[PDB]
Amino acid sequence: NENLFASFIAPTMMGLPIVTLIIMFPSLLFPTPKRLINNRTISIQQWLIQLTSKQMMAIHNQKGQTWSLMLMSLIMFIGSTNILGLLPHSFTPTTQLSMNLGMAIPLWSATVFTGFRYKTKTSLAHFLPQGTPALLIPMLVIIETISLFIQPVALAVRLTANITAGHLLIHLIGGATLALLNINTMTAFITFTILILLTILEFAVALIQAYVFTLLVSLYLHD
Amino acid sequence: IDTAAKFIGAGAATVGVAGSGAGIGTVFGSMIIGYARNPSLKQQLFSYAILGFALSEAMGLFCLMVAFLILF
Amino acid sequence: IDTAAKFIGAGAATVGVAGSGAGIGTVFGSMIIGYARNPSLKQQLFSYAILGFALSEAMGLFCLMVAFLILF
Amino acid sequence: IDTAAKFIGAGAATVGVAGSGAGIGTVFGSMIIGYARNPSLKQQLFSYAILGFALSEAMGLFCLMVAFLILF
Amino acid sequence: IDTAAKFIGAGAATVGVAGSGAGIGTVFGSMIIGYARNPSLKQQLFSYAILGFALSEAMGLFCLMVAFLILF
Amino acid sequence: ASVVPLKDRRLLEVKLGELDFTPSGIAGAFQRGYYRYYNKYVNVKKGSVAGLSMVLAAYVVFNYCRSYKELKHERLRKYH
Amino acid sequence: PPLPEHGGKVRLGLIPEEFFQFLYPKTGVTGPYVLGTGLILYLLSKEIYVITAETFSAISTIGVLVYIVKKYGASIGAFADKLNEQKIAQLEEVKQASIKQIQDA
Amino acid sequence: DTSTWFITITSMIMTLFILFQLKISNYSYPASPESIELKTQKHSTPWEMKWTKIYL
Amino acid sequence: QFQFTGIKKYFNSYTLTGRMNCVLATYGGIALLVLYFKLRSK
Numbered sequence: 077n078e079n080l081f082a083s084f085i086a087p088t089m090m091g092l093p094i095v096t097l098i099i100m101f102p103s104l105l106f107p108t109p110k111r112l113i114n115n116r117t118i119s120i121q122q123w124l125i126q127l128t129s130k131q132m133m134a135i136h137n138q139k140g141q142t143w144s145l146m147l148m149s150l151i152m153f154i155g156s157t158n159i160l161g162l163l164p165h166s167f168t169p170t171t172q173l174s175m176n177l178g179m180a181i182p183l184w185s186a187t188v189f190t191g192f193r194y195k196t197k198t199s200l201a202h203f204l205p206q207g208t209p210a211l212l213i214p215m216l217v218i219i220e221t222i223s224l225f226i227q228p229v230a231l232a233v234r235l236t237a238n239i240t241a242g243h244l245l246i247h248l249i250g251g252a253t254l255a256l257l258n259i260n261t262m263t264a265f266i267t268f269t270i271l272i273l274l275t276i277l278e279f280a281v282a283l284i285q286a287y288v289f290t291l292l293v294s295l296y297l298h299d
Numbered sequence: 300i301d302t303a304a305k306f307i308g309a310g311a312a313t314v315g316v317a318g319s320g321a322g323i324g325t326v327f328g329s330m331i332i333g334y335a336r337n338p339s340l341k342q343q344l345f346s347y348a349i350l351g352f353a354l355s356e357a358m359g360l361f362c363l364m365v366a367f368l369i370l371f
Numbered sequence: 372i373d374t375a376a377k378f379i380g381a382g383a384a385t386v387g388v389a390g391s392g393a394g395i396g397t398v399f400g401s402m403i404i405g406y407a408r409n410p411s412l413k414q415q416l417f418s419y420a421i422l423g424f425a426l427s428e429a430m431g432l433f434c435l436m437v438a439f440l441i442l443f
Numbered sequence: 444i445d446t447a448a449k450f451i452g453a454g455a456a457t458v459g460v461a462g463s464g465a466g467i468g469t470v471f472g473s474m475i476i477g478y479a480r481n482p483s484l485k486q487q488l489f490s491y492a493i494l495g496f497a498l499s500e501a502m503g504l505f506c507l508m509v510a511f512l513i514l515f
Numbered sequence: 516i517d518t519a520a521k522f523i524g525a526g527a528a529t530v531g532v533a534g535s536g537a538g539i540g541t542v543f544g545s546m547i548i549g550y551a552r553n554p555s556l557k558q559q560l561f562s563y564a565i566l567g568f569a570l571s572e573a574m575g576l577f578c579l580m581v582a583f584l585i586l587f
Numbered sequence: 588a589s590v591v592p593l594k595d596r597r598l599l600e601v602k603l604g605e606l607d608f609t610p611s612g613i614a615g616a617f618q619r620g621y622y623r624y625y626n627k628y629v630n631v632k633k634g635s636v637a638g639l640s641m642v643l644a645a646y647v648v649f650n651y652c653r654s655y656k657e658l659k660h661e662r663l664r665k666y667h
Numbered sequence: 668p669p670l671p672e673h674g675g676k677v678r679l680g681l682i683p684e685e686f687f688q689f690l691y692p693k694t695g696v697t698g699p700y701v702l703g704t705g706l707i708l709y710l711l712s713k714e715i716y717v718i719t720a721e722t723f724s725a726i727s728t729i730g731v732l733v734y735i736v737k738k739y740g741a742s743i744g745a746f747a748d749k750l751n752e753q754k755i756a757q758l759e760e761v762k763q764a765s766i767k768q769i770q771d772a
Numbered sequence: 773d774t775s776t777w778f779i780t781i782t783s784m785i786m787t788l789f790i791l792f793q794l795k796i797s798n799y800s801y802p803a804s805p806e807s808i809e810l811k812t813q814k815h816s817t818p819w820e821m822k823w824t825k826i827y828l
Numbered sequence: 829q830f831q832f833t834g835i836k837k838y839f840n841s842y843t844l845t846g847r848m849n850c851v852l853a854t855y856g857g858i859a860l861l862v863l864y865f866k867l868r869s870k
Contacts, residue, residue, distance in 0.1 A: 116613075117633075
């Protein structure tokens, strides 16, 4: 009975203040120069695109490369609006589940209607995998279609659910420091747990690779 | 009456993460034996450690999503 | 009493993802080692992991759909 | 109270489909590590995964059909 | 009913924190099969284990606060 | 008032870090921006910290105002 | 573990020496400083108003952003290096076009 | 928290994808520049043969 | 109004399939209604 942890009971509030300012604000962090040589703070933004435009280009190698100049705009928005919110009292728009159901469905259904305007038969004859055996046709095409319509829900809900899960352990491990007016040795160890956990919460960049990329595979496979 | 049922339905919901507590244990133990064979770590071998980590934590944390909704 | 048994009813069925929560750790821990031995990932050796992931994350959200349909 | 056991019974009965979750994460990952060493997939290598997928799937949907038949 | 409800939500949450012990069995264990092929020891080999050992424990000490979140 | 707020960002951006006007940012006003922290963020030479870390320090104290009404907590006194 | 213990002891001594050096430097500058004591009051008056909460995680998200300023002095080299090839990438075309033509004339 | 009602943010997201398609559209590319590297040579190379046929 | 002709060649290329927010719009309208419905019955 040496080190008694404490807790504080307080509501954890994802309120909704004025959003249409907060959305526009990580656009003005990135400038664009009309010059040949630039000014050594855009120049490391301009290099960072060159890299990851050469990995969502290499797989496709089609005349579906026209689509890929948009997919690098999709990575900078939720790459920024997940990285701004680590600050003391900032607010992330990708916390709320509303816009992510408007980021999945106008993009996911832009893929199944891409081959249906050109191929019209073999896009969803990709439901036929192989040299058809007999005992498992109905066990297959009720499975590979129930794992198609999961994909818009599978794409949006994986983003909202772990981003907000980062924010609660920021509060709760952090709030247990404030309410630790018992023995002062254990206060540092909870603080040292925080400054490790904030390094893990720069996997909010790592979770945007797993949103543009499984949009490519959900584009490359259909087209 | 359902005040306990608020608890155990949350108290049982949390142990569904116990897969992904081991599922990332595979992908980091399985990387060092993919690395000691072939020391080219700056290539795409380390990039398949994080996407395997992120796709496993994507199925990791949202099991705790159903935990809070039963509470709150 | 209809409400309270629903609250623990979805709590037990949360952990159906715990099989897919670590079954996605193995198959993405087995392409770290199959790309290490033979660098030919751009053929079948990557599309056999996403096809491994589609037919194994078909069963993660498959059970949470039941834990919703027992709740409402 | 009779329907109260009808709901919590299918709550744990669909945990048996999680066993077809982590059990399928291996047999699709073993067609990664054992493909590069021997490229003969159109022979019985892919065919012994489809048998390995389906007959591992048959114990997945069987523990789903218990949760229907316990409730109705 | 108050101390009845609290404790069986707390014990049933601590099952998930030994659900990540089975991962560091693989993390600390698969260092063995890597070290015997190649003895480049104080390279990233042992240090990739720390990226495995403390990230898999990071899902172990994940749920342990959530258990003490429902102690109070 | 639109040409008033538009001439805040344009004037500030050139002055804070970089633009006969492009090399004016090559020396930079980062030496002017430096003295606020203590000395330590010295890496601002081509990845410029004081150019960026002022906006993000402005967006924090702007969002401290909205939260102030909710987390009151203050007694009939001052703190330590 | 013994080796780890020795290293820690060595690290502890060096830190103390550094602290002593810092203290001497602070002592020297006692007369000529008129900057901080103008603004140390507003952070002492507002800290007497409201600013205490569950935000000790305010410092640790500002402490980790100090360690990246260390590697930022290597990001500069990368930044300087970035486009050197691109500018050179432009120097190759202005050099090739003149010399390949003037001999042909 | 479990928020509600959704009439908010989603109309303020597509105004943002008029911004990001404006900035990122003006990006200099090393690869694109490289593709303009050989367009100047072989017009002057056959122009050397334009005087080789004008004489011979 | 020059936020158009810089990207007008892009629009009628891919908005043939990309500007199908009708499904998104339909879902949103329904979502607002259900919330109202549950607050109507409280």
